[PDB]
C-alpha cells in the first residue's frame, strides 16, 4: 500500500533544457577530430 510514491524523484527533479550548442560532427569527419587531437598538443 506504499506504491503511491511511484516515480517520486522523476516528478521532483528540476527540469532544465538542452540549451543551444553546436551541431555535432559525424562520419569520417567525426573520426578526424578524435584521431588528430592526441599527439599534436600533448607532449
Amino acid at each position: 500500500g506504499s506504491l503511491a510514491r511511484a516515480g517520486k524523484v522523476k516528478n521532483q527533479t528540476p527540469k532544465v533544457p538542452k540549451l543551444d550548442k553546436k551541431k555535432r560532427l559525424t562520419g569520417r569527419a567525426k573520426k578526424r577530430q578524435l584521431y588528430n587531437r592526441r599527439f599534436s598538443d600533448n607532449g
Binding site: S2, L3, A6, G7, V9, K10, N11
Partner: protein
C-alpha cells in the same frame, strides 16, 4: 501478451531495501498468472 490484473509492490532482498513495482499478468496464450517487473521510475503509473 497478457492482461494486467493488479499492481503489487514486492519487497527486495535483505541487503537492499526497496519496493519493486510489479504487475500480476494473466497470459492470454494459456491463462497462467505471472509477475512482471515494471522497469522505470514512474512507469507503474503509466500502466493501468
Amino acid at each position: 501478451k497478457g492482461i494486467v490484473v493488479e499492481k503489487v509492490a514486492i519487497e527486495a532482498k535483505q541487503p537492499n531495501s526497496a519496493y519493486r513495482k510489479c504487475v500480476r499478468v494473466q497470459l492470454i496464450k494459456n491463462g497462467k498468472k505471472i509477475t512482471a517487473f515494471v522497469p522505470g521510475d514512474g512507469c507503474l503509473n503509466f500502466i493501468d
